[PDB]
Amino acid sequence: NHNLHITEKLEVLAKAYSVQGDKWRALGYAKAINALKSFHKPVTSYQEACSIPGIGKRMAEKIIEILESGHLRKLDHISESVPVLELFSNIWGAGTKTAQMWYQQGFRSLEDIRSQASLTTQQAIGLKHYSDFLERMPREEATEIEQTVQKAAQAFNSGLLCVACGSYRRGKATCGDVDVLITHPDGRSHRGIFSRLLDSLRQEGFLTDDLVKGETKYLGVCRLPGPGRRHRRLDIIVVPYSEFACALLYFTGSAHFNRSMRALAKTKGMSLSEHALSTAVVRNTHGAKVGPGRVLPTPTEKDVFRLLGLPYREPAERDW
DNA sequence: CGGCAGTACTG
DNA sequence: CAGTACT
DNA sequence: GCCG
Ligand SMILES: [Mg+2]
Ligand code: NA
Ligand code: NA
Ligand code: NA
Ligand code: NA
């Protein structure tokens, strides 16, 4: 990154807007920051600033203040609440609205939350694992977790296919969590497996707590056996084989990659989700779907790219 | 002016 | 529903 | 915040 001296300070403002609930402005900042992180050359002129897609006048104005002054004055006026709101919204299950409410109620520390806050079931689990859930794990450990799930799944039905997606499949050296996709080529045998699979994973103590237990998605907490192990977040999704490619594409991400691909699909009169790529999507002036299109056949990830007019990108080059 | 991705889950 | 979360 |  040729512009750390710029993006480092912009990340601070971005985070501030984010934890305070100003999501669209934070989005703008996030996008400008990626753009600036990707520019070969350091940004040396306002005129060059506006050159970058994702940098407007307001953003160029700021980047010149830093290159001239070495600082950004707006940093000095960020509300004193922001570190506390960040502290609180790093509890899994608590977002900006809950953090703001706890702040308004006078809470300032996790000890305050522990002793005085009303916590949802999910938030109590998040609090219990506060430090662990902020740690990334070695990808070698994500491998062990994926293998644990696969062996438990295969025990019931040999034919079940299990794949660790997310940052793991994008090849990263560390992973925030483990994202396992499960399906079955027969197109039928995936149904109703969660009961048995999850019960199997609790049997000898691997699954330690459940956060979400839906018909298609599980989000929870696991810990491998032995000493020196931390609790890790584990997501599992079970999908029909006909949706495998789009589920794989969604679950591999990155998030910003997914949002860019879906935005592209919308421009082309199409819609892309975890379930399918659809064409002839009828929308309103609000950008929202009011009429459903036709599902297009997408046997492989490459097919999704092709139908969108894009060259195929391996998971490693989706790390946006 | 107004979208900024599209979806699942919780209570 | 609003909130939070997933990529 | 940015952009069509
Ligand atoms: Mg992940
Ligand atoms: Na620009
Ligand atoms: Na949170
Ligand atoms: Na009190
Ligand atoms: Na995940």
Numbering used by the authors: 251 to 464, 470 to 575
Question: What does the paper behind this entry write?
Answer:
X-family DNA repair polymerase (pol) λ performs gap-filling DNA synthesis during base-excision repair (BER) and DSB repair. Erroneous X-family polymerase (pol) λ nucleotide insertion leads to genomic instability in double strand break and base-excision repair. Here, time-lapse crystallography with right (matched) and wrong (mismatched) natural nucleotides captures snapshots of pol λ undergoing DNA synthesis. The intermediate catalytic states uncovered reveal hidden fidelity checkpoints that enable DNA polymerase discrimination between right and wrong nucleotides.
Cleavage of the Pα–Pβ bond, inversion about Pα, and Pα–O3´ bond formation were evident. Octahedral coordination geometry and coordination distances (2.2–2.6 Å) indicated the catalytic site was occupied by a mixture of Mgc and Nac. Binding of Mgc resulted in a change in the primer terminal deoxyribose sugar from C1´-exo to C4´-exo, repositioning O3´ into a catalytically compatible position. The broad omit density surrounding Pγ in the GS was not observed in RSMg. Asp427 could be modeled in the GS conformation and in a rotated (~90°) product conformation. This rotation was observed concurrently with loss of catalytic metal coordination upon bond formation.
